Paper text:
AMPA-type ionotropic glutamate receptors (AMPARs) are integral to fast excitatory synaptic transmission and have vital roles in synaptic plasticity, motor coordination, learning and memory. AMPARs are tetrameric assemblies composed of subunits GluA1 to GluA4 and exhibit a modular architecture comprising three layers: the extracellular N-terminal domain (ATD), the extracellular ligand-binding domain (LBD) and the transmembrane domain (TMD). Here, to determine the subunit composition, physiological architecture and gating mechanisms of CP-AMPARs, we visualize these receptors, immunoaffinity purified from rat cerebella, and resolve their structures using cryo-electron microscopy (cryo-EM). Our results indicate that the predominant assembly consists of GluA1 and GluA4 subunits, with the GluA4 subunit occupying the B and D positions, and auxiliary subunits, including transmembrane AMPAR regulatory proteins (TARPs) located at the B′ and D′ positions, and cornichon homologues (CNIHs) or TARPs located at the A′ and C′ positions.
Residue numbers in the entry:
A (entry chain C): 389 to 543, 592 to 815
B (entry chain D): 397 to 547, 596 to 819
C (entry chain A): 389 to 543, 590 to 815
D (entry chain B): 397 to 550, 596 to 820
E (entry chain H): 6 to 40, 55 to 82, 93 to 166, 171 to 208
F (entry chain F): 5 to 40, 55 to 81, 93 to 166, 170 to 208
The structure:
Amino acid sequence: RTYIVTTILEDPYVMLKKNANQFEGNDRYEGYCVELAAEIAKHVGYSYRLEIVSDGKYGARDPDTKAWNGMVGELVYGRADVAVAPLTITLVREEVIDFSKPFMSLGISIMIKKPQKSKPGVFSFLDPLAYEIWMCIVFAYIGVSVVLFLVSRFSLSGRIVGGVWWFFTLIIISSYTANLAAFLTVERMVSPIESAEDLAKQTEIAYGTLEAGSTKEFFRRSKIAVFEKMWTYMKSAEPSVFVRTTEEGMIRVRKSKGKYAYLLESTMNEYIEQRKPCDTMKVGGNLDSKGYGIATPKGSALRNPVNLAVLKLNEQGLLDKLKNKWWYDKGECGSGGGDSKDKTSALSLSNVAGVFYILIGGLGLAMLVALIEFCYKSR
Amino acid sequence: VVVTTIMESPYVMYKKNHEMFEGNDKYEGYCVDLASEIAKHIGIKYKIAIVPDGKYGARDADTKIWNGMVGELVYGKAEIAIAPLTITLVREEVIDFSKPFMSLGISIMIKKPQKSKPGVFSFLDPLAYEIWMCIVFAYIGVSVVLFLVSRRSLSGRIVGGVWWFFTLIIISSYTANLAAFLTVERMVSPIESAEDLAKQTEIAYGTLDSGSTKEFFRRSKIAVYEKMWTYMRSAEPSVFTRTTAEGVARVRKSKGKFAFLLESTMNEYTEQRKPCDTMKVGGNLDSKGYGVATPKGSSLRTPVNLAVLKLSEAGVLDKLKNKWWYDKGECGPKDSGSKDKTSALSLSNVAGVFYILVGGLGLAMLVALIEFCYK
Amino acid sequence: RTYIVTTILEDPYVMLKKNANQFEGNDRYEGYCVELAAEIAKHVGYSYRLEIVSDGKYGARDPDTKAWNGMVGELVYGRADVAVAPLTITLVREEVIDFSKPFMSLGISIMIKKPQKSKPGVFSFLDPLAYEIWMCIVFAYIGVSVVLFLVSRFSRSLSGRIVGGVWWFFTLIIISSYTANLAAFLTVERMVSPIESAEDLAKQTEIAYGTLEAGSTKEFFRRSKIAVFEKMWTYMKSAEPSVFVRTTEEGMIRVRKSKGKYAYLLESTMNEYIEQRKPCDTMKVGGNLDSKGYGIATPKGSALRNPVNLAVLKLNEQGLLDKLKNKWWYDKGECGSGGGDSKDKTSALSLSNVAGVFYILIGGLGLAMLVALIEFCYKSR
Amino acid sequence: VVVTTIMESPYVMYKKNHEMFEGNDKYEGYCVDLASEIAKHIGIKYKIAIVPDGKYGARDADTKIWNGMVGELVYGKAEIAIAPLTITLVREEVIDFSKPFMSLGISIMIKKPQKSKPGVFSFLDPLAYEIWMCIVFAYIGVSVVLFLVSRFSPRSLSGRIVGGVWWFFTLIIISSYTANLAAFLTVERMVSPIESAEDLAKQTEIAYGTLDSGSTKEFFRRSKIAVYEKMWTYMRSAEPSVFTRTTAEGVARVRKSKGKFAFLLESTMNEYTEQRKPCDTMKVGGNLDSKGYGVATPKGSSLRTPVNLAVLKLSEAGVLDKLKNKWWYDKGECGPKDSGSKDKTSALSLSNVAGVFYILVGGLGLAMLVALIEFCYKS
Amino acid sequence: RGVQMLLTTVGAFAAFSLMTIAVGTDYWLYSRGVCEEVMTHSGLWRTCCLEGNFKGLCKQIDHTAEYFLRAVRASSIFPILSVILLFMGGLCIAASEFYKTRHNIILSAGIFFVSAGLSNIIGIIVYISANAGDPSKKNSYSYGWSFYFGALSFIIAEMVGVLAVHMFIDRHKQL
Amino acid sequence: DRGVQMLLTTVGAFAAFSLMTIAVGTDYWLYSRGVCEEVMTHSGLWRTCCLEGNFKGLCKQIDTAEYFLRAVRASSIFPILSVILLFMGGLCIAASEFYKTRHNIILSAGIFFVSAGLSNIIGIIVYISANAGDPSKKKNSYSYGWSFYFGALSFIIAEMVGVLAVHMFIDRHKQL
Ligand SMILES: O=c1[nH]c2cc(C(F)(F)F)c(N3CCOCC3)cc2n(CP(=O)(O)O)c1=O
Ligand SMILES: O=c1[nH]c2cc(C(F)(F)F)c(N3CCOCC3)cc2n(CP(=O)(O)O)c1=O
Ligand SMILES: O=c1[nH]c2cc(C(F)(F)F)c(N3CCOCC3)cc2n(CP(=O)(O)O)c1=O
Ligand SMILES: O=c1[nH]c2cc(C(F)(F)F)c(N3CCOCC3)cc2n(CP(=O)(O)O)c1=O
């Protein structure tokens, strides 16, 4: 006999094929879930037919006024055989149907925009001061030069002018050194965001999640002290969650210039790490431990072979290979497919380039006015 | 049972949804939640009522009638006073009070201490005056010993080396101190930080026209509050404020301004209000308390006393105060300090050396002119 | 008729007079509570004869034996009407007797050992570059001097220019190192802040703190539900050293022995008294953790319940309580007579730590003038 | 009801030395408290078995006799077994398994370095590298242009301009150097030379050793991903006997020496050693694999479903993370002092300043050699 | 010879014209003040709004050691003495080019030029200190080239002063 | 002051030889506390031996940009260079005292004096950099022995005999 499987149209798992109608049938979708289904069908041995759920939603086992939705409802209604799909393990789903094995670990990630600061040229030279300060320093240079010239041509006024100029440049150099040291050690002592206690301690970047779902249930039923503090901080909702769906929150975080954060699943973050343009990274560890599974009927003969095959594939490592190739080969990013940036501190000819440029410009002006002097000697 | 409550900003708010329900759950804050907590602790059917007098209750001592919540309690129109009220000797033989659940006293609040922006003192901030005219003494000593040895040699090399090393240590210490000052940008609290440090300072202080503060300041025998009273009386007539709104408008204008001398309730309320600019408490003075009231011959006095005492000891009013006074705030920078952008140095922090250099050049050209004139 | 009052002497209330037994008994008692008792006896009018407590305790609930002790135990079991000795307020004390008013506001205070500022002399001058490299630069200077002398006498020259340049590079690099190091010391000594409140104490870990077992502070901390106090209790539970102490005196002498990192969290009055004690080894910071209070104790149905209430309210309103507190807590204190002895907080390099360069400057000019005199007298020979 | 657990694990311990709360409620730790928590839910009779066998559980091919907790389960002496079982195939075809309550994965181990005291590299560490000979090239340029200016037409304006711009150069370069060195000394940031498993395979400078025999060694020998093939080929050329016999020997060896002899172990034991008395450990994060620890029952019975629902309902409820957090982060005193300590001033010793001393002394030496040589040969 | 006399004379005349167009229109500083960050052009004695609903509505403006600096900034005695000193220097050079028999007038005029540069630098530094000494709480610090041709006046005054010194040396050598 | 200066130079050379022999014969190079528990030990390059403890009598010695420094510290070429250059300078001044007709020998002797100063100063700096590099821990350290003081005395007496020899070499060549 034949068997039917169901899958929900999702970006990290199902590809909407561009050719589409010219290749219909079993070869209509490609991706992680359908390749897993093909591998486990080759392992156990049967014929599988793909199907699409009517509502297009994950569904839940909430005890509402009947009308259960999702794969769990579609399978408890009896018109299903197996259901391979991204599904979160929960007790209400476990109460009527069991799952085989957790083949993937999920956690809660934190969204941080990519910090990129291009180093300027001559602008960075004048950065640790003011423009009117440089105007005044060149004005004072002209003033001390003309006083020295007049006291040389008139003839200890020259000595006292030299002394006050030495005192003046003494203070100028000390002040500039102090200001530059202050700026660089302020830039050094920055703290990147890791885990949750840093977020609870900074109280400067807004963080939120979806209005409902597993993350909202975890936040509402939170009991970790730092997570309880974070939940109470988010309960004020002065800027609120300000989100409607996943892509809307992603757009808001990207347009917030790093001033906003979102708490979404580690699977979604790892998928969006390379598919999206490289502006967000994963930091810290998983905030919670949860897994996935494959839905099987509680009283069917296809309960043990599916578990055995999925656990064999998990132990073999071909699942890890397929996940790695699907999540790294077809990625529009170079954060993980190429070399990263090594933090070596120090400088790399970035801010001192402009003063080198004005150095060469001053030597050029000096040698051209010396050429003018030599041509005046030619006469 | 019926209870009166006066409209005040730390305690009871009108709900945003005014049309949600008229009656019990129409107000939120500290006072109504405390009333609900003691009602749940004891067990009674309670409502919410508002006194139509607008006063807190003071004996006029001429017509012999009591007003406010105490007047409503005395004249047989109320039996519970959940509205906070300070305990006073005059309002004890006419109404009986419970044990105080909140401790408050006369406190100091000052305007926002910003960064200093001087013209000459900014250059004077690193090191000190003593070191600087000791530098002057060292310089004139170097000059006189150079003139002595003048009348290539070992002595000249030695004196040049030690002078170079000396000014080297001076520049290094100066640069280190200035770098530390720019790195930390640590603010220093003003002079008004204690009772006496408020006493000898020249900053003008202001208060309300009448109230607990004026009543306490009418009679004194401490010989420091006497000095404060003489300072207040000899100052400008703008010290007295008819309303605290005019006073806060005055104190937000000037850096020194007319600083308040009031109880800590409005201090801790306004340190975390919408304009988070002043969050200063300084020290504490005097001692007061807030408690509920009960008329005589009523058996619920002992029950409400035990209820409020148990609630204070196991701890539920401290939770309410922390939730609705510190957690409930428009800004988070008051509870935990933050940093600020260092930004550019501008010129006002370095304007001192410019004037000194240009004046030195000017005096050099005058003394050159005098040298030409006398020769 | 006559009346008796039960008081307990711990500190500094029922301290005995200087002449001890030379007085007549009751008339030899100085302190806060005895003066308050005399005043409130003068307000309404009754005999203020002093009694002696039996066991010296303050009283505690013992539901297992259904007994009582202390001043409250003496008052509940007859033969007592007024307990002048101040005591804390618990639920059982209000259940068995009644208090009128709290005559003072007080709570739990967090303390720290007072640091001492001792600026050294010439030692701080060579401090920011260890010890040996000052020696190294001294012989480096005489080495560059001997090289310069030999190249000047043995020979403008190219060999002199490179020596001058490398000496210049040496001076600028080592003085940049000295400036960076001194900025490091100043910054590190500057951004640190003294402890304050309870939450800043909660993030701090190496400072440590602990309280006595036989006290209401431990019961308050164990029964607290505040998340900050929850963290307090959870860290206090994981105590590997002997953090707990039995009595106050042993804990305080242990604190004075270390005086680098501890906090005991005792009651406000005792901490203020220690602040006014001749050791002068602590500073008080922060505010009251809780809102505990004192009060006077009277039996039920007595005729001296309402007059004592009006009397204590009269003392609260008149400010004579503050007068007695100032007199017996600041005037009699032998330490900290001038509390504002250090309040300028002038945080800058003064003459007390940079004077080493001045001393070596004066020494160098002294040697310079002696060798100049030696050259002059050699010429005069 | 008899429940069994292993004693040679960092999850159970003996209270004090002897006669400390004798009975069933004698041992304390994560495993026994988790067993009590899952017993209090369904209502099973808690007990202690702790029978040892010298091994955690295995199946020899020639003997065909199972051992350990699984060996006790298959032949039958208990019905509930809570113990740290890595669920795999060969134990799955014999007895069932429940949903794991925690994640797993092999994580690399490196001893955390304290500081670095180099020689010439300490001198060259601040600023940059190419800046130094950029100044020496600029100095050569100023010298040659000054000499040609003097030779063409011997001070004047050109000398004043070139002297002023050279003075500006020396002040700006010393100000930048002083600012950088001050920012280095005030606060420091630690990143470690190791960052990831791919970088671990790429660096090829630190010795790696998994174990003499175990799950890690079996996974390494049976791996399939090319980076793990590179790691295995590195393991083939293992000269200094990196085949660690015991886990205690490996951590004892990596504690003494940090330059080499890195250890490979699971995340649980690594995080346990993170909070131990030497207090000197470091991990980079990221799990190479994904396993878990779960309970097992002899075949299927009524206790299977009860314990599965009990451990799952404990997994969504915040109590298992409670136990994990409180145990692992409260019996370890090293991690209480989070981040770092700013009370480490010290001073500039000789080792990081002596490089310029060597440069100065060599410069004066070669200067007087070349001076005597040129005076002896030119004349 | 006389070519440098013509050069310094036309330089002084250009200095006077540049001075009077400096002390003429009030187009000194551009700031995002309030007539809301509305753009107004501020000078010395008067400030009006170049765009907004208040077009055509122009209003007057004003402003131990700090008291002296703010009094100097409000009174603006430094530009007054600068322009008086420059006018006296111009009259002296006019007398010098008219009366050839006078000797010390060239040195005097050089002194007036150097002190005019002195007055210019003290005036500009006190102006920057005055208008940057009130930071209050973006593009507030904008310049409309006014200080640029103030710098031009400074450098041309310095040039004519050093030329006057050089020709005093020349005419003393010719004596 | 010419013959007395000859006497001063030869006495300084003999004192330099005596200080070199004392330095190479020194057993208490540095007062370092440790284990033979932290107790005071007399650190020695040839024999690092203890004075207090139950193990007195038996004792054993201590042992790109880092290999060379460690190698030259272990081989201890600095005392060898110091004694070789000092002996060469002393032989040169002794020969100059013997036969006076040559004048380049005293300039040469000044050259060996300044190169011996070079050698012992680089030996001092390499030894301090070698023994100061112990970042593993030791609350109390340093407290250097008198060997460093004797080496400093040798360095200063070498530089003063060098400058005196060069100065009067130029002199005696001038009046020649
Ligand atoms: O079984 C479930 N499996 C789920 C699997 C995923 C994911 F893997 F990411 F696709 C998500 N995503 C969460 C992030 O935004 C996109 C959807 C939600 C799931 N939900 C609903 P929750 O309760 O909101 O987690 C379930 O119920
Ligand atoms: O018990 C008392 N508690 C009081 C508590 C407060 C407040 F701080 F707001 F909570 C005030 N505010 C003083 C400032 O203006 C607004 C009302 C008055 C109180 N009064 C009357 P007072 O005599 O004017 O102090 C009492 O009697
Ligand atoms: O009524 C009470 N009044 C108390 C008054 C004081 C004091 F501060 F000395 F006035 C103290 N001290 C606290 C500091 O250590 C020494 C004893 C304890 C009191 N206790 C016991 P606790 O509060 O359970 O420790 C009471 O019960
Ligand atoms: O059931 C099992 N549970 C196990 C649990 C653990 C851990 F939790 F980490 F303590 C370990 N650690 C492996 C690393 O060294 C320390 C011990 C081994 C286990 N093994 C043997 P494996 O075959 O080597 O995994 C089992 O059989």
